[PDB]
Protein backbone atom coordinates (compact mmCIF):
# COMPACT_ATOMS: atom_id res chain seq x y z
CA UNK A 1 0.00 0.00 0.00
CA UNK A 2 2.74 2.43 0.98
CA UNK A 3 4.55 3.53 -2.19
CA UNK A 4 8.08 4.95 -2.24
CA UNK A 5 8.93 7.87 -4.59
CA UNK A 6 11.66 7.84 -7.22
CA UNK A 7 14.63 5.81 -5.94
CA UNK A 8 14.56 4.93 -2.23
CA UNK A 9 18.22 6.00 -1.78
CA UNK A 10 18.63 9.29 -3.67
CA UNK A 11 16.37 12.32 -3.87
CA UNK A 12 14.21 14.09 -1.32
CA UNK A 13 11.66 11.65 0.13
CA UNK A 14 13.79 8.54 0.63
CA UNK A 15 13.44 5.30 2.56
CA UNK A 16 15.40 5.89 5.79
CA UNK A 17 17.97 3.25 6.76
CA UNK A 18 18.60 2.85 10.49
CA UNK A 19 21.16 1.21 12.79
CA UNK A 20 20.90 -2.03 14.74
CA UNK A 21 23.34 -3.59 17.20
CA UNK A 22 25.94 -5.26 14.97
CA UNK A 23 26.81 -1.91 13.39
CA UNK A 24 27.10 -0.31 16.84
CA UNK A 25 29.43 -3.07 18.06
CA UNK A 26 31.52 -2.76 14.89
CA UNK A 27 31.82 1.01 15.34
CA UNK A 28 32.75 0.54 19.00
CA UNK A 29 35.49 -1.98 18.24
CA UNK A 30 36.82 0.14 15.36
CA UNK A 31 36.95 3.22 17.60
CA UNK A 32 38.78 1.17 20.24
CA UNK A 33 41.32 -0.04 17.67
CA UNK A 34 41.79 3.52 16.41
CA UNK A 35 42.27 4.83 19.96
CA UNK A 36 44.88 2.12 20.54
CA UNK A 37 46.60 3.23 17.33
CA UNK A 38 46.50 6.85 18.53
CA UNK A 39 48.07 5.80 21.83
CA UNK A 40 50.82 3.80 20.12
CA UNK A 41 51.47 6.71 17.73
CA UNK A 42 52.01 9.22 20.56
CA UNK A 43 55.73 8.60 21.16
CA UNK A 44 58.60 9.29 18.73
CA UNK A 45 62.23 8.25 19.14
CA UNK A 46 64.60 10.58 17.25
CA UNK A 47 62.46 13.73 17.76
CA UNK A 48 63.02 14.80 14.13
CA UNK A 49 66.24 16.70 14.92
CA UNK A 50 68.25 13.41 15.05
CA UNK A 51 67.71 12.17 11.48
CA UNK A 52 69.23 14.81 9.21
CA UNK A 53 70.81 12.08 7.07
CA UNK A 54 71.15 8.58 8.55
CA UNK A 55 69.86 6.41 5.67
CA UNK A 56 70.44 8.76 2.73
CA UNK A 57 73.39 6.66 1.56
CA UNK A 58 71.15 3.62 1.06
CA UNK A 59 68.62 5.72 -0.87
CA UNK A 60 71.39 7.13 -3.07
CA UNK A 61 72.77 3.65 -3.76
CA UNK A 62 69.29 2.35 -4.61
CA UNK A 63 68.71 5.30 -6.94
CA UNK A 64 72.05 4.70 -8.66
CA UNK A 65 71.20 1.02 -9.08
CA UNK A 66 67.79 1.87 -10.55
CA UNK A 67 69.42 4.35 -12.93
CA UNK A 68 72.01 1.78 -14.03
CA UNK A 69 69.27 -0.81 -14.58
CA UNK A 70 67.09 1.62 -16.56
CA UNK A 71 69.94 2.97 -18.71
CA UNK A 72 71.17 -0.53 -19.64
CA UNK A 73 68.29 -1.31 -22.01
CA UNK A 74 69.43 -2.85 -25.30
CA UNK A 75 68.12 -5.51 -27.69
CA UNK A 76 69.30 -9.04 -26.91
CA UNK A 77 72.23 -10.72 -28.61
CA UNK A 78 71.86 -12.40 -32.00
CA UNK A 79 73.74 -15.64 -32.66
CA UNK A 80 74.16 -17.91 -35.67
CA UNK A 81 73.34 -21.09 -33.71
CA UNK A 82 69.60 -20.43 -34.00
CA UNK A 83 69.75 -19.80 -37.75
CA UNK A 84 71.83 -22.96 -38.15
CA UNK A 85 69.74 -25.33 -36.02
CA UNK A 86 66.52 -24.01 -37.59
CA UNK A 87 67.50 -26.15 -40.61
CA UNK A 88 66.56 -29.25 -38.57
CA UNK A 89 62.85 -28.90 -39.45
CA UNK A 90 63.20 -31.25 -42.44
CA UNK A 91 65.45 -33.69 -40.56
CA UNK A 92 65.26 -37.34 -41.62
CA UNK A 93 66.64 -40.53 -40.05
CA UNK A 94 70.25 -39.37 -40.06
Amino acid sequence: RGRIPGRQWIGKHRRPRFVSLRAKQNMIRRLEIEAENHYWLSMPYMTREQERGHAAVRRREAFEAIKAAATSKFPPHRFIADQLDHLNVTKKWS
Binding site: H13, R17, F18
Partner: peptide, 25 residues
Protein backbone atom coordinates in the same frame (compact mmCIF):
# COMPACT_ATOMS: atom_id res chain seq x y z
CA UNK B 1 20.28 18.00 -5.12
CA UNK B 2 18.95 19.95 -2.14
CA UNK B 3 20.44 22.82 -0.17
CA UNK B 4 22.08 22.64 3.25
CA UNK B 5 19.08 24.13 5.09
CA UNK B 6 15.55 22.94 4.30
CA UNK B 7 12.22 22.52 6.09
CA UNK B 8 11.64 18.76 5.58
CA UNK B 9 14.31 17.78 8.17
CA UNK B 10 16.26 15.99 5.40
CA UNK B 11 17.54 12.59 6.53
CA UNK B 12 21.30 12.59 7.05
CA UNK B 13 23.84 10.21 5.54
CA UNK B 14 24.09 6.59 6.66
CA UNK B 15 27.55 7.03 8.20
CA UNK B 16 26.50 10.25 9.93
CA UNK B 17 23.38 8.54 11.29
CA UNK B 18 25.47 5.61 12.55
CA UNK B 19 27.89 8.01 14.24
CA UNK B 20 25.06 9.94 15.90
CA UNK B 21 23.42 6.70 17.05
CA UNK B 22 26.63 5.24 18.49
CA UNK B 23 27.55 8.52 20.23
CA UNK B 24 24.42 9.13 22.31
CA UNK B 25 24.09 10.27 25.92
Amino acid sequence: GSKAVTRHRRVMHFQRQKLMAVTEY
